[PDB]
Amino acid sequence: TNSDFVVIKALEDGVNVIGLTRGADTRFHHHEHLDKGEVLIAQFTEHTSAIKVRGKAYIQTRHGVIESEG
Amino acid sequence: TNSDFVVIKALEDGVNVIGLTRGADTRFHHHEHLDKGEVLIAQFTEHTSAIKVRGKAYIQTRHGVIESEG
Amino acid sequence: TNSDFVVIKALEDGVNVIGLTRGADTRFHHHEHLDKGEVLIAQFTEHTSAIKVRGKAYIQTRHGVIESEG
Amino acid sequence: TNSDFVVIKALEDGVNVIGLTRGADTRFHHHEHLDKGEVLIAQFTEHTSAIKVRGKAYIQTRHGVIESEG
Amino acid sequence: TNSDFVVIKALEDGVNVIGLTRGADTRFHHHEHLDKGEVLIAQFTEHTSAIKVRGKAYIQTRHGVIESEG
Amino acid sequence: TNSDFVVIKALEDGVNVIGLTRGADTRFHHHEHLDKGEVLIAQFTEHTSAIKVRGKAYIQTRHGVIESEG
Amino acid sequence: TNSDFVVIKALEDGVNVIGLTRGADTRFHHHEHLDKGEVLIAQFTEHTSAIKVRGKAYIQTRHGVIESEG
Amino acid sequence: TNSDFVVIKALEDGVNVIGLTRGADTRFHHHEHLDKGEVLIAQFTEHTSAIKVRGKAYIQTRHGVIESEG
Amino acid sequence: TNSDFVVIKALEDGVNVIGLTRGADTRFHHHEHLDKGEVLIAQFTEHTSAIKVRGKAYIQTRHGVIESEG
Amino acid sequence: TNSDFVVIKALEDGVNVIGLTRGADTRFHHHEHLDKGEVLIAQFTEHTSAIKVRGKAYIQTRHGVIESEG
Amino acid sequence: TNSDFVVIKALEDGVNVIGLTRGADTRFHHHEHLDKGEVLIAQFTEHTSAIKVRGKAYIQTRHGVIESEG
Amino acid sequence: TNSDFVVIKALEDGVNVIGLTRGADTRFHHHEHLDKGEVLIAQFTEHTSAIKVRGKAYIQTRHGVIESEG
Amino acid sequence: TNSDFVVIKALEDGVNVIGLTRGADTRFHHHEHLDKGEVLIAQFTEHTSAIKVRGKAYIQTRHGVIESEG
Amino acid sequence: TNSDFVVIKALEDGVNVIGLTRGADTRFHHHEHLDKGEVLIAQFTEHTSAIKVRGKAYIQTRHGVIESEG
Amino acid sequence: TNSDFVVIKALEDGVNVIGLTRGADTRFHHHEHLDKGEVLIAQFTEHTSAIKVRGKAYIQTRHGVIESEG
Amino acid sequence: TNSDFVVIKALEDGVNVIGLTRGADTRFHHHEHLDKGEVLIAQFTEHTSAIKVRGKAYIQTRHGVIESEG
Amino acid sequence: TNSDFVVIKALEDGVNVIGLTRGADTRFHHHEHLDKGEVLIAQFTEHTSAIKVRGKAYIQTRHGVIESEG
Amino acid sequence: TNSDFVVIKALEDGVNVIGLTRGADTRFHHHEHLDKGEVLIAQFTEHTSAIKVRGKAYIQTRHGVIESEG
Ligand SMILES: [Co+2]
Ligand SMILES: [Co+2]
Ligand SMILES: [Co+2]
Ligand SMILES: [Co+2]
Ligand SMILES: [Co+2]
Ligand SMILES: [Co+2]
Ligand SMILES: [Co+2]
Ligand SMILES: [Co+2]
């Protein structure tokens, strides 16, 4: 519900990061734009239950590294 | 009950991710569509107890890495 | 009581995952069908205390990997 | 009192798994039949404090792997 | 008080497992007989504080493996 | 107070295990006899704060293995 | 205050183990004599805060092993 | 419900006689050990509805004689 | 209604004895498993009105001796 | 009214035992199916006054032995 | 008034068994059809005081065996 | 008063069976006609104390067999 | 419940006859010692349900004569 | 509990017949002396549950005849 | 308590028949003198529980015939 | 009534020491078994008034030494 | 009740001194183990009324000196 | 109870004198150390009922002189 975070680095211009709400319904809550080279450190909270990443990006989580190729 | 997440990367167009209800009866509660190259970080919550994945995909959990080919 | 999950991947058509009821008496309360290639991440909850797996399947738990040949 | 599970795989037909009752009085409260190849993941709860396994079987616990030759 | 367990496998016929009472008074509270090849997984409970094993047996605990030759 | 245990195996006939009371006063409250080959798994409780072992025995604790020659 | 213990083995006759009182004023609370070969497993409690060991003895703690030669 | 009895003679060492309780649930109630040569005359009562005999024994009932070869 | 018994001796491993309910509707109420060579003396009670026997077995009643081969 | 029983042994697959209701009106209230070799011990009760047997069967009553060829 | 039964076996097709009512007024209250080879065990109750059998049949009672040639 | 019965088989056409009233007054209360070959099983009741049989018939009672040649 | 007796004749010095308690729990209730030649006629009572005989002895019951060779 | 008797004949001078009480405790109630040739017919009562016979005597019970040699 | 009797015939002059008191206390309650040839049919009653016979006499009981030679 | 003791030493296997109760009725209260070589120091109490010794034994009292030969 | 004592000296390893309960019921209430050479001066108390000595030992009482050889 | 004393003289360095508590529960109460040559005159009281002496010592009581060698 908290206390865990992800690290996303943008590898190209125009990377989109979307947060899905917490509750009975699942609706979009917010989105963020990242330009090439930017780093975002995001946390799981009371209003966020899922994080969706579009665009070429490098992601670090507790389970290791992954690369999105959108 | 809460505070654990899975990482799903879509390896093909049209991958389905389904969340099942938490309660006495089990029913489909929400689903998400993923495009090729896209990444979702999903958490276990107060309305979701099980997660099904349809389509070719790459999954990371606390127990390791698996690949689905449905 | 909660907060622990298993990962099941179906290696054949028609794999059955049965949940057993939590309480004084024990009975089947839910069946799940998996087709060849699908992956299910299932959690221990307030209504489930045991899980039975019939069919050829690949299972990951905190204690390691096992293969069912039912 | 809770939150610990065992993994039992039946290596031959007709394996019996018996659960003992929690309290001042200890009585047999349920048993399960396993056919050759099936897998059961079972949890310690408020009504089960001990588990007995009869028949040839393969068991995984937090302390390692054991085999019953019954 | 609870939430720990031992694994006992009987290496000969007629193995006795005795549970001693928890409290100011210390007395035999229950015992179990194990046939050859059987495996018992036993948990420390609110009514059990000590466990005595008579007969030839193989025991797994968090501190390692031991062999009783009673 | 609880949630910790020792494993004692008797290497000779007539091993004595003595449990000391918990509180302002410290007096013997119980003892147990062990024959050659027997194994006792004993827990720390609300009425026991110290344990004494007389006789040739082999002991397993969280800090390792020790042997008493008494 | 609890949940931590020391293991003392007497290597000579007449080993003294002294407990100091828990509170604002510090004084002797109890002591124990150990004969050659005996093993004592002692726990920290609500009435004991420090432990003194006089005589030749072998001590195991969470931080390692030490030998007293007084 | 009463007024009828069985006679069991032990033909070998270690014969077990088990009594099952009377009521809606059927749980074990008591067991007895017989050494080679002993005779037990047991009655049906308010807390006993079935009797189970393990081991080589010679049994006399109103319907005649039988021999268990366990 | 009460006070009559049957004697069943198992002539093979895995013999099932089933007791049916006493009431308006008839349902399975309990079952027992018997090993090769064991004898059960069962009584008619306030919750049991009929008894079914599956497996090779030898039966004694007031009316004589019969053999089942199911 | 009660306290008397019949013994039926099935000599062919699919033997039917029908119970007739006790009271002013008479109707079928229970069917029982027996496979070849099974034995049923059935008692006259507060809801059963007559018993119909269809199929090849061997029947024992207080008056002797009969064989049905239905 | 109760607790006595007759055994009727139908030796040819179309055997009729009629029960007469108990009380000051005697009237036909039920009848049964039996096909060749069928067996019926019937009891005397609070609504049946006499039984009439038409057709070729074989009857067993406490007084012996009789045959109806109807 | 009750709970005894006679068996009458008609050896010729038109056999009359008459039941006489129980009490201070004695009178015909009911009669039955039997065709050739028929069998009637009749019970002594609260309204019947004596039975008269006219016509050729074969009678079985607890005291033996008799033949009426009326 | 009551009203049935056994006859025990001691064929050697020091024969033990043990009576077990009637109720929910079973324990020793009394015992008797018999010298060579003595005869005891013992009745089933409201505080006794089972009887053990240790030693060489000759026993008479309603079901016949048996000998204990303890 | 009542209404059953034994017959004892004295075959030697000085035969002793001892009666034990009926209740929670088994305490001697009375004894009787018999000279050579005497016959005693003794019944089971509300204050008597067991009978011991010392000396050379001849005993008749419902189960047959025995001879005490003491 | 009642409904059983003995038959005593006096084979010599002066035969004594003594009745002992029924209750917690036992004492002589009555006696009868029989001359040679006389016959007495005596019953067990509410005030009598044991009977002694002194003198040469012939006795008939439910268990057979005996001869007293006092 | 109090404060006096006897000393009993067993000179043979199986010596019996019986204590008689203090009151209007002098009856057995307890017995004790002594093996060869044991010594029992027994006092006179409020529930004890007499002591019987059976078997070969050596007794010391205030009045001197005696030897029981039984 | 008090004011008297015994003196026991242990002449061998492992001498047992057992105290029996004072009252209507008699049971083991405490025991002491003596190593070779030790001396125990024991007193009769309000809770102790008899004392047993097992093992080789030397005993002094008001009546003199005795030697136990258990 | 009181008013009796024992004289102990230490014949070697380090002699231990242990006093045992008076009451239903028996447990160590106090100990005393004696060096070579020292003398202790100890009494019996309401908190002491038994006394143990470890080490080489010379003891005087009302019953005489004894020596401990421990
Ligand atoms: Co935008
Ligand atoms: Co969709
Ligand atoms: Co047991
Ligand atoms: Co089953
Ligand atoms: Co005894
Ligand atoms: Co007179
Ligand atoms: Co002990
Ligand atoms: Co000190």
Side-chain angles (χ1 to χ4, degrees), chain N residues 2-5 7 9 29-30 32-34 36-43 45 47 58 60-62, chain O residues 1-2 4 22-24 26 44 48-54 59 61-63 65-70:
Chain N
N2 277 315
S3 300
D4 210 357
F5 71 95
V7 169
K9 179 188 181 180
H29 204 224
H30 206 72
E32 274 293 309
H33 299 265
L34 294 190
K36 184 179 180 180
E38 286 213 40
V39 171
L40 172 85
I41 292 101
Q43 206 186 13
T45 52
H47 312 251
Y58 180 99
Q60 287 180 346
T61 47
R62 178 168 20 139
Chain O
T1 303
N2 280 305
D4 214 351
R22 173 199 289 259
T26 298
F44 281 110
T48 298
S49 63
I51 289 171
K52 284 173 57 61
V53 173
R54 302 214 188 113
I59 314 173
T61 46
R62 185 160 39 148
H63 309 330
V65 293
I66 207 160
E67 309 222 17
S68 83
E69 302 174 355

Side-chain angles (χ1 to χ4, degrees), chain I residues 2-3 6 10 12 14-15 18 21 24 27-30 39 52 54 56-58 67 69-70:
Chain I
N2 295 308
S3 295
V6 303
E12 85 173 2
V15 168
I18 311 161
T21 323
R27 188 190 65 83
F28 289 4
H29 168 237
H30 62 267
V39 178
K52 194 190 293 183
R54 299 209 180 109
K56 175 154 166 176
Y58 178 92
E67 294 180 357
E69 306 167 356

Side-chain angles (χ1 to χ4, degrees), chain G residues 31 33, chain R residues 31 33:
Chain G
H31 64 296
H33 301 267
Chain R
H31 65 291
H33 304 268

Side-chain angles (χ1 to χ4, degrees), chain M residues 31 33, chain P residues 31 33:
Chain M
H31 66 283
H33 299 266
Chain P
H31 67 292
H33 298 265

Side-chain angles (χ1 to χ4, degrees), chain P residues 21-60:
Chain P
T21 192
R22 182 193 295 264
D25 50 350
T26 300
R27 58 188 64 256
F28 295 7
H29 174 215
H30 204 72
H31 67 292
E32 274 293 308
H33 298 265
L34 294 190
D35 199 351
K36 183 180 180 180
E38 296 193 51
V39 171
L40 172 85
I41 292 101
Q43 206 186 13
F44 276 106
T45 53
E46 286 308 300
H47 312 249
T48 293
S49 296
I51 290 170
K52 296 163 71 178
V53 171
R54 291 209 187 109
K56 182 150 171 172
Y58 180 99
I59 314 173
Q60 287 180 346

Side-chain angles (χ1 to χ4, degrees), chain F residues 20-35:
Chain F
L20 282 79
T21 320
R22 174 195 297 265
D25 54 345
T26 302
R27 290 176 172 105
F28 294 166
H29 96 262
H30 201 64
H31 69 293
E32 294 283 331
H33 303 265
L34 290 191
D35 316 49

